Amino acid sequence: GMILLIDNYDSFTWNLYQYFCELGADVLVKRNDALTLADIDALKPQKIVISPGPCTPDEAGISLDVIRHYAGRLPILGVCLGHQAMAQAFGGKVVRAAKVMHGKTSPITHNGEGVFRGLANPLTVTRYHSLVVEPDSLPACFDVTAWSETREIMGIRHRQWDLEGVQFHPESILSEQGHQLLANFLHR
Amino acid sequence: GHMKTLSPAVITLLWRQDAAEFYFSRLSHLPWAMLLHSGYADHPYSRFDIVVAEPICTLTTFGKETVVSESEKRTTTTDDPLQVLQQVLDRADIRPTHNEDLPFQGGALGLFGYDLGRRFESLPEIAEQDIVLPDMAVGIYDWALIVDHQRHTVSLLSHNDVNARRAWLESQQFSPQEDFTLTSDWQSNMTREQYGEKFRQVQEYLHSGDCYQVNLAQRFHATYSGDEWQAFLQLNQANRAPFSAFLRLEQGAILSLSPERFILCDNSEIQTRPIKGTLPRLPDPQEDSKQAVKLANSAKDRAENLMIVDLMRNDIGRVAVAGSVKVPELFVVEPFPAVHHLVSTITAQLPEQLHASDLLRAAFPGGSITGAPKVRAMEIIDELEPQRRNAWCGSIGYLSFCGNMDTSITIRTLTAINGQIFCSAGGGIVADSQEEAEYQETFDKVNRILKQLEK
Ligand SMILES: C=C(O[C@@H]1C=C(C(=O)O)C=C[C@H]1O)C(=O)O
Ligand SMILES: N[C@@H](Cc1c[nH]c2ccccc12)C(=O)O
Ligand SMILES: [Cl-]
Ligand SMILES: [Cl-]
Ligand SMILES: [Mg+2]
Ligand SMILES: [Mg+2]
């Protein structure tokens, strides 16, 4: 029932808090420099969410260490920066997109797996990102779950563990089926 | 001792549309005299003008220190200034029930300057501090004069002898002063070339993924002589802005012609109405009608706006009751004398264990005049803007003894201090922004204010 949301000093984190609370979760929000790994072990969260934020995973405080340590131990969802961090944690690379997309929606195509279970295809989603996961260096442990019209990675999921990323914002007012998407992570 | 829950005593005065400016004229020279004015606007959120003066307590915050002043007691504290404000409100022991016709029943009223945000996040100190005017300048008032343009009612309310307050008001005289005159031309704090350099640095941060939007501002300055109240009377008529205000502070005067609501809390119903997206008014009525449609359909302006809608859902979402955050309106065009604007509306509910002061603390300063993500945007503003914003792009408003609140964003706001007057103007830089268009957007917002004061 207890979800730890790691806040990368972002201005969308509390939209994720609101959606998970509406779904009936207990949610604790902590900034990415307000916690150590030892602190997380004492809190005993059931799942972890890595929030969006500015800059790159290297500037995301404890987020990369949390991903590496709890991989296979607790379910983890990564949103935007959190998704980039998940790819980087297993040896992927984060690069500039062809076109920045800030407060613009895009139709994405998905395979109906992971957090896309039960969602219509395609799905219109809001983007707030200048960077993407480089498709060539995506670690073999990840399946791409979703693509943009220009074949940019919009989602990844680990083949073995509950460890999943989306590049877009399910919690944006113009994203489709964002409650149901997050419900998949909460209830599976 | 005795907690008062009784509704305040009310004397109804003669209905006149200009009641607020009429009575405020005789108060405008007194430190801690304050006016909230709806600008006589024909607008969905233009109803009330509110007048206060002669506070029972004052709160003045400069940086880490707040000074709380009451008749025979002066206290200083480093505590969170909005926590101290809520403590002072509670200790007044005035606790009336909400009245939809008297949204302010006494309580706190004044200024939350932009640099108060340094108390809520850890921010760099590059921009210069060249204006000495408090980060928080708030009076506590046990009375008010309320003008209600919907009911055509003028109400004088008091928790402590409304007849004595009425006789005090009748005894104050408007002995008019020399008219306002500018005594220099307006000058900016930056050249077109400097603005360009700063615009290009924002675009580098947009492309690197540091930020998605930064509001970059310049500041106009002139010398002046004569009465600031006379300047406001001229500006208020001309601007028709529903969140206007005049504050007489110890240190100088704040003349606000803001059309922007920051946060309303009305019987625990939260509303925020971020303004993002602008085009100039055109003199031909046929062309101006088409201008409104152009703004409504502008992809760049809709991106600029949407991003702040998601940011305000977040900022209100820090405290809102789970499941209460809604967006009833996206991308409505509102015309003002200088500009068309794109406005959106976000609603939520305040939990019973929280205060409007907690909602202000969670959201301040407004995402509409910073950008996204907000902490990074505020770091970039401090890096690029040569002087701190002080009163400009803060908030003016009230925290009622009943729990209600209303606040502006102090855009289109002048600071008049030591015979100097300052007027700032900015705009949201996003990926599709162009350098010259954004420079001209700053002028479009304040050109009519600057030019009206040159005459
Ligand atoms: C800072 C200002 O701009 C702000 C941003 C707007 C825009 O960029 O279109 C419009 C209203 C304001 O919230 C200003 O009014 O001076
Ligand atoms: N327009 C507001 C009152 C108001 C006028 N100016 C303001 C400045 C700040 C806050 C509120 C106000 C109303 O009708 O209720
Ligand atoms: Cl502090
Ligand atoms: Cl009227
Ligand atoms: Mg703009
Ligand atoms: Mg209380």
Author numbering:
A (entry chain AAA): 0 to 187
B (entry chain DDD): -1 to 453
Task: Quote the original article.
When Gln was added to the crystallization buffer, we found a glutamyl thioester (Gln-TE) adduct covalently bound to the catalytic aC79 within the glutaminase active site in only one of the two PabA/PabB heterodimers, indicating that under the given crystallization conditions the glutaminase reaction proceeded only to the Gln-TE adduct without performing the final hydrolysis step. When Cho was subsequently added to these crystals, it was bound to the synthase active site of both ADCS heterodimers. Consistent with previous observations for related MST enzymes, the benzoate moiety of Cho is complexed by a magnesium ion. The central part of the tunnel is mainly formed by hydrophobic PabB residues and terminates next to the 4-hydroxy-1,5-cyclohexadiene-1-carboxylic acid ring of Cho, which is the reactive group for Cho transamination. In contrast, upon additional Cho and Mg2+ binding to the ADCS synthase active site, there were no further significant alterations in the PabA/PabB arrangement, consistent with only a minor regulatory effect of Cho/Mg2+ on glutaminase activity. In the ADCS structures with Gln-TE bound in the glutaminase active site, we consistently observed a distinct water molecule interacting with active site residues aY127 and aH168. This water molecule is in an appropriate position to hydrolyze the Gln-TE, as illustrated by a close distance of less than 3 Å to the Gln-TE reactive carbon atom, which is subject for nucleophilic acyl substitution, and hence it is referred to as the glutaminase catalytic water molecule. We also found several interactions between the noncatalytic amino group of Gln-TE and residues of both ADCS subunits, including bG207 and bY210 from the PabB subunit, allowing the catalytic center of Gln-TE to be positioned with very high spatial precision, to generate a catalytically competent glutaminase active site arrangement at the PabA/PabB interface. In this arrangement, the entire exposed Gln-TE surface not interacting with PabA residues (25 Å2) is buried by interactions with residues of the PabB subunit, demonstrating that the ADCS glutaminase active site is shared with the synthase subunit PabB.
Here, we chose aminodeoxychorismate synthase (ADCS) from Escherichia coli, which consists of a class I glutaminase subunit (PabA) and a synthase subunit (PabB), to investigate the mechanism of glutaminase catalysis regulation and its impact on overall GAT activity. PabB catalyzes the amination of chorismate (Cho) to 4-amino-4-deoxy-chorismate, which is a committed step in folic acid biosynthesis. GATs comprise minimally a glutaminase that produces ammonia, which reacts with a synthase-bound substrate to yield specific nitrogen-containing products. As evidenced by analytical gel filtration and isothermal titration calorimetry (ITC) data, the PabA and PabB subunits form a heterodimeric assembly with a dissociation constant KD = 0.16 ± 0.06 μM.
